[PDB]
């Protein structure tokens, strides 16, 4: 029980597709390109995460002030609750002071 | 009418038959079979068209296609790639063995040129008249759509009108004279019904 009786299908991986063979390219766009572009500008994803890093509380705060006016009513309500909970947890709970 | 589950699995039996319901009850949910998306225009295999089996138990054999299932891209050849099953089995009688055809995918069969009984690939083109036809890649020749019996089975060439069938002289006679009167107005003229009373205004809201 809890363990399969048959081997899973083989995992064929193409190590030389377009995405893998060209991974890491242009990561030196600034140093080798007269600093016209920045390697963090190559990053794709949420507009509140491009070229930025932080903990969960900072990510929620940054997300709320950038795309908060575009979030759905239920999603925005959940984000506000998460910020309220994280504020109390980090600033009032823990082992170190 | 038609009541199909969202992930209904098409099979050899037609939908709605007694065996189909038992094979596919409304509550069962099986893994959907992956089907290569082929447009209806790009499909080039029809019923009654001889095709050659490329891969299977009997490869390189040519047989007539009796049925095609577009949902699973299936082609059935009569008497080819057939297994055996006992039909009409009862408690006392073992049964009678009959050859049952197995469906073949469109990639496992290849159309044969009418001039040369060899498998070949075809591409759609247009003739001078504009009628769309299928033309073989090698030694391009016209491959007409084979004649197949209609689903209902009625043959126009051997049809005798019944007592409740309108004749062709009466079903095609043109009696409509376009005018600016409705059916209700026109019928009261023929029936002769007279109504001097005038309809009163009614508020609509």
């Amino acid at each position: 029980i809890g363990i399969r009786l048959t081997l899973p299908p083989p995992k064929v991986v193409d190590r030389w597709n377009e995405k893998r063979a060209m991974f890491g390219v242009y990561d030196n766009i600034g140093i080798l390109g007269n600093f016209e572009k920045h390697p963090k500008e190559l990053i794709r994803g949420p507009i509140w995460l491009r070229g930025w890093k932080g903990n969960e509380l900072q990510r929620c705060i940054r997300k709320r002030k950038m795309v908060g006016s575009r979030m759905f009513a239920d999603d925005l309500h959940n984000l506000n609750k998460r910020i309220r909970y994280l504020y109390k947890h980090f600033n009032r709970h823990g082992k170190f002071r | 009418k038609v009541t199909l589950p969202p992930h209904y699995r098409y099979g050899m039996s037609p939908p709605g038959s007694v065996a189909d319901k038992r094979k596919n009850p409304p509550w069962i949910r099986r893994r959907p079979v992956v089907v290569e998306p082929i447009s209806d225009e790009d499909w080039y295999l029809f019923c009654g068209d001889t095709v050659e089996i490329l891969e299977g138990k009997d490869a390189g054999k040519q047989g007539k296609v009796v049925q095609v299932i577009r949902q699973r891209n299936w082609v059935v050849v009569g008497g080819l790639n057939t297994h055996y099953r006992y039909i009409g089995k009862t408690m006392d009688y073992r049964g009678t063995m009959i050859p049952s055809e197995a469906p073949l995918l469109h990639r496992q069969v290849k159309l044969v040129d009418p001039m040369d009984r060899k498998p070949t690939e075809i591409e759609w083109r247009f003739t001078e008249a504009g009628e769309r036809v299928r033309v073989s890649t090698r030694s391009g020749r016209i491959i007409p759509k084979p004649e197949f019996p209609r689903a209902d089975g009625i043959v126009p060439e051997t049809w005798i009108d019944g007592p409740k069938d309108t004749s062709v002289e009466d079903a095609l006679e043109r009696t409509y004279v376009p005018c600016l009167k409705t059916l209700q107005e026109e019928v009261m003229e023929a029936m002769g019904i007279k109504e001097t009373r005038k309809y009163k205004k009614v508020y609509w809201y």
């Binding site: - | 409740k164 069938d165 409705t182 023929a190 609509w204």
Partner: protein, 181 residues
């Protein structure tokens, strides 16, 4: 007579009854209104005979002789009804210019959603109708929040629907790489 509710006695008990095709919409456009009006009851009396036979088939627990006969009549009835309505709709546009026979309007209900209100016919005008005035055709500002909630609910359904399709296409190329090529 009541004999018109049943088929010919010689046809009673037979397994199959030969019947022709159903009238098509183009074949019915060559007939006049008087001819279509007469043809309407020819098909109607035939339809009552088929409904009577079908019910007795279930009563006797036997299959209907020619079930396809009922489908042909139903198609004939719908096609004939389509032709008559189309002629009146075309004539209504020529004389009045209205694309709908029944009056109506676009009004917001009490729930804030746009609906097509079909007008009814009343003897008295609308400002004197006690029952009509109790109905509310305006939404108060407290409904605007629920309108957004319903809009966002539709967005999630559409977002899931669009995302699922792209998942199917990407997975379907794994087993059939020739599709991409």
């Amino acid at each position: 007579g009541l004999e018109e509710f049943f088929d010919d006695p010689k046809n009673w008990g037979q397994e199959k009854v030969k019947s022709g095709a159903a009238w098509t919409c183009q074949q019915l456009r060559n007939k006049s209104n008087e001819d279509l009006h007469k043809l309407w009851y020819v098909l109607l009396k035939e339809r009552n005979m088929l409904l009577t036979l079908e019910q007795e088939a279930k009563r006797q627990r036997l299959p209907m002789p020619s079930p396809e006969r009922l489908d042909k009549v139903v198609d004939s009835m719908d096609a004939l009804d389509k032709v008559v309505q189309e002629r009146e709709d075309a004539l209504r546009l020529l004389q009045t210019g209205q694309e709908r026979a029944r009056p109506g309007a676009w009004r917001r209900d009490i729930f804030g959603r746009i609906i097509w209100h079909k007008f009814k016919q009343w003897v008295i005008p609308w400002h004197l109708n006690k029952r009509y005035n109790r109905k509310r055709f305006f939404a108060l500002p407290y409904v605007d929040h629920f309108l957004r909630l319903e809009r966002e609910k539709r967005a999630r359904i559409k977002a899931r629907k669009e995302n699922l399709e792209r998942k199917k296409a990407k997975i379907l190329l794994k087993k059939f790489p020739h599709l991409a090529e």
